[PDB]
């Protein structure tokens, strides 16, 4: 529960420690079934407004079915496609005959049942909506006359409710070529999802975590539609399976670090590279570069290992002894000294250069701190907002202690004349070797 932060004055970086992990390592596939009604184009001679409204929505029903066949004609266009290979594999098994009828036989008794597929995969099936039973029992004998019948409007409105979810299904499948994420509430109702999470094979502790952070599970799950035949449409919904839980996570925040020399254009800078989410995973650390690829319920981190990067466990040494002999801490160099500010979880790192104003201000008591030229940090305690130049930043109000690690800025240890100031993705060893090789040429002079 304790959330900690440590600002590194020497490297102009901060690490937010005390976070718990939830890394997606596997995929669970579930087949969702809608029992459709195979009807041919009917036409009876009536002008009744009851049967007129039925024709309009039967057309919308028939159009959504025939268009979902047109989408079926479209081969999976998303990807990449590594992330959906499990759902595609289930779709391919549904093509085989004697598999669509297997689902139909197992779902006649109950709205949910486990089925063993031909590929040996044991998946749970769900008949969310039964259009077949309703349309044939309620609406078929009405319009099965020489002229359209005269039934009341109560049955027509209920038919609007049934057809409304199907229209919502085909409209989301069409714009996304049958692969939608996050899984909308119509692909799988929130009530249906919790029932699906309770069934699926994992512990009660792992089920409790997924059922509490539902929205995060929806954003890390794909809805894939596979086929339509035998009066049934089927689409597979992949669900994240998390194999790494409760391992240490920490987020690295980096800000430029320059010198404070007076004459303009005579300053060198460097910035810590590889900022983002770090989490221990199987004796190593998994790096997450892309922003918002990790979701975060407070104190818990949810990420996917597909957008990851494997790093050795010694990578955390760059947060203490950046000159460590074990790992190659990456930095980028430049002479651009623009004033910026990074909002970390328990404060804000501020890099103030030039004449631009840099202040941390509290709305009630006013400005509480004015930042001098350099890189510094302000604790979130008693600080509402932080301003840099003409840009206003707001500080997070998460409760926790923040530590200030004092240290000489490493940018002061380098000579500006032989300093390489255009290294996009370099390391300490490269900067150390490039300078010594540059000084090797000046000695021979």
């Amino acid at each position: 529960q304790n959330i900690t932060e440590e600002f590194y004055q020497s490297t102009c970086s901060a690490v937010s420690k005390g976070y718990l992990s939830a890394l997606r390592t596997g995929w669970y596939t579930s087949v969702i079934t809608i029992e459709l009604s195979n009807i041919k184009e009917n036409k009876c001679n009536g002008t009744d407004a009851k049967v007129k409204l039925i024709k309009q929505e039967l057309d919308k029903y028939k159009n959504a079915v025939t268009e979902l066949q047109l989408l079926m004609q479209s081969t999976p266009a998303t990807g990449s496609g590594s992330a959906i290979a499990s759902g595609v594999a289930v779709c391919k098994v549904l093509h085989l005959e004697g598999e669509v009828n297997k689902i139909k036989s197992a779902l006649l008794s109950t709205n949910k049942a486990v089925v063993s597929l031909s590929n040996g995969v044991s998946v749970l099936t769900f008949k969310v909506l039964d259009l077949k039973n309703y349309i044939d029992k309620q609406l078929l004998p009405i319009l099965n006359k020489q002229s359209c019948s005269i039934s009341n409007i109560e049955t027509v409105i209920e038919f609007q409710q049934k057809n409304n979810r199907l229209l919502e299904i085909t409209r989301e499948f069409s714009v996304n070529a049958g692969v939608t994420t996050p899984v909308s509430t119509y692909m799988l109702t929130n009530s249906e999802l919790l029932s699906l999470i309770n069934d699926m094979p994992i512990t009660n502790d792992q089920k409790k975590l997924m059922s509490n952070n539902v929205q995060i599970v929806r954003q890390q799950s794909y809805s894939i539609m596979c086929i339509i035949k035998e009066e049934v449409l089927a689409y597979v919904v992949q669900l994240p399976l998390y194999g790494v839980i409760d391992t240490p996570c920490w987020k690295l925040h980096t800000s430029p670090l320059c010198t404070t020399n007076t004459k303009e254009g005579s300053n060198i800078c460097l910035t810590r590279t590889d900022r983002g989410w770090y989490c221990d995973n199987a004796g190593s650390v998994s790096f997450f570069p892309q922003a918002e690829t990790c979701k975060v319920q407070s104190n818990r981190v949810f990420c996917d290992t597909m957008n990851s990067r494997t790093l050795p466990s010694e990578v955390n040494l760059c947060n203490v002894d950046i000159f460590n002999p074990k790992y190659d801490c990456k930095i980028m160099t430049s002479k651009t000294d623009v004033s910026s500010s990074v909002i970390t979880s328990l404060g804000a790192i501020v890099s103030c250069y030039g004449k631009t104003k840099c202040t941390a201000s509290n709305k009630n008591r006013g400005i509480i701190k004015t930042f001098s030229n350099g890189c510094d940090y302000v604790s979130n305690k008693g600080v509402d907002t932080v301003s840099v130049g003409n840009t206003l930043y707001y500080v997070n109000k998460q409760e926790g202690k923040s530590l200030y690690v004092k240290g000489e800025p490493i940018i002061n240890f380098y000579d500006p004349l032989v300093f390489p100031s255009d290294e996009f993705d370099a390391s300490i060893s490269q900067v150390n070797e490039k300078i010594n090789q540059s000084l090797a040429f000046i000695r021979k002079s």
Copy 2:
């Protein structure tokens, strides 16, 4: 109203002048209220189709309420979160007891009223939909029988209209974890928004601008949902507050500038860096790097100062005397001479290199100009489209004069042998210093 453009032949860049500003500097928070009905699971013994449709939507009603509580269990996952700290602060004050009842007491008389919160913030409250009064007065005494009643269908359909907006609210909150942008029409009706803009504290001139460009205000506003208790759901909608209006804005367009030497691979190039939106703000210029972070009703520019960058006022000198002694104009160098074209607001900059065709063509009279090797500009007058290689570009038809600033291309002033041709983010001073230091080594030879 006058829109001007100036192409700089020396730097292969153009500036579109004559634009008015609208920079977001603050946030106004408004609490939106939906009076919910606290009902326990009712079950009466009836098969009437009137009461059957009620049960279906009451389940959808109860499910949307209980799921919106599940979303409430999810801590704010978006961000960052600087941009929503004001809305979060209002959400936290709503948690305190004696605050939810304060909103309920002030909204019993009118559908809108200003409320003073515990945090000293004066915010306007809105009861958009009153589900509590309708459900209890119209539907409670019907189903408050030993068996479900037999009321007509007119009341059931009206209940579908009320429940439809709530289902639209929870479905948008669920996919976005309660933070949606742009604010949809269901979070706040267009009619409700104009009424909210008229009330809010600002001048009639600032209210007239927001009420005219509604869609731009929606795209720069966040909908945040805070809590559900005491038969009321509440969600705060932040609205942009613009403190900078009618200050000069101009958009910088840059295109590569190479040499025209015949032998392949013997050409050097450079391109002006920091292209995008520039607007004067409080004695300085605010730079906007990210595209589409600024919206633009013609002749008016709408941007947010959070995605900004503060630059000194002398930054505009890079558009005239790029060799100015005051500011360090940034350029990037390379030897890649690919033919490209940038569509500016009143024409198009064309960089033609190699043998690729570069023509400005009018659909009625045909090709009007053929571009030679180098960087040039064509006015939008009498020009419909511009083609480069196999890529077709269309020119904007905005009315205004365009000026051609003749000048020797600066790429011709540099010696290709000592020229650094791999500078990602460099400046004129660095290129000037790097070449002189390279020539310092050849003199000692």
Copy 3:
């Protein structure tokens, strides 16, 4: 139908050949019309629930019309705007009087008809919904009384169906400022689209391709709304027109290539630049850098030439003889040896460096291959997934042969001491020239 892949061991790259093209070269504009009803605010003295529901939706009807006028007040804010200049041009012609009435006269007889505009453009018009005829014939004489009438509910529900699509139109136009893509099913029904594709001028073969891959056409089409007047709203829907069909396409996949020296930090790397989609177009090759700018029904590639890049036909030589004297193959250099894996269409390229595990595993028989240090490739035959470190990758199951082109890795031909290892966007000639110039300084020593 044959899909081929060739892995290049010397360059650590693979090319997926055997694909067919479909490049968008032009735009076809179609005017979509909804005949609106011009009604003034009516108020009759009734409390009937039939006429009460009418007032609620007439307000939603009137609000959607008046708000769509507010959106009309917003000048086109999207772009750029090259891609929509054709639709904007049609919108501007609709402003001229005697043009809105021309559409109204030609659509009174049929729901679809071709119209010659003032700009000489021949466009097909579509009256998708006729709100004017329905509202005035069915609902006007009802409420045209001194007190609201007592008509039944069948007509009210049909009015809900008509007004529902209009509310769907204005809600999508509002969030996107009137420019939406992909074109939703409500901007143009799937049934209306196929009828539009059949009419439009092109061959039966080009019509058959568009009608089969409907969803891809929707994602490469824009819906633009132009004006509201004379009881008619109009919005233009641009449709892709493909001028390049059945030309060779191939996708280039690149992975880092490093050395295998034991001592850490003593390795140099290089990676092929310009990975993505390549397609021959008019005697040259069109390069597509941005991912997902090309859609892909299997065996067919759909791209837009606006996000393209024109390259000479000799660019394919970088896939065989990278040291070719005709073209300058671009590579980037670094010393970062991170283990990665690229999922190509018929396998996976794996770059294994360090101690990180690199295995290709089949779920039934287990691990089938362990990758040594370097860059290698594994065929999709009998391989389900491929793991690198803590990241799991899944292989595509597309059927086709894959060829292994053996060759000495070019990274072994370079001396690490004089090797430039920080070239972001460089070429072979630059690396060749930079090393020789570095060796020119060591000879004079």
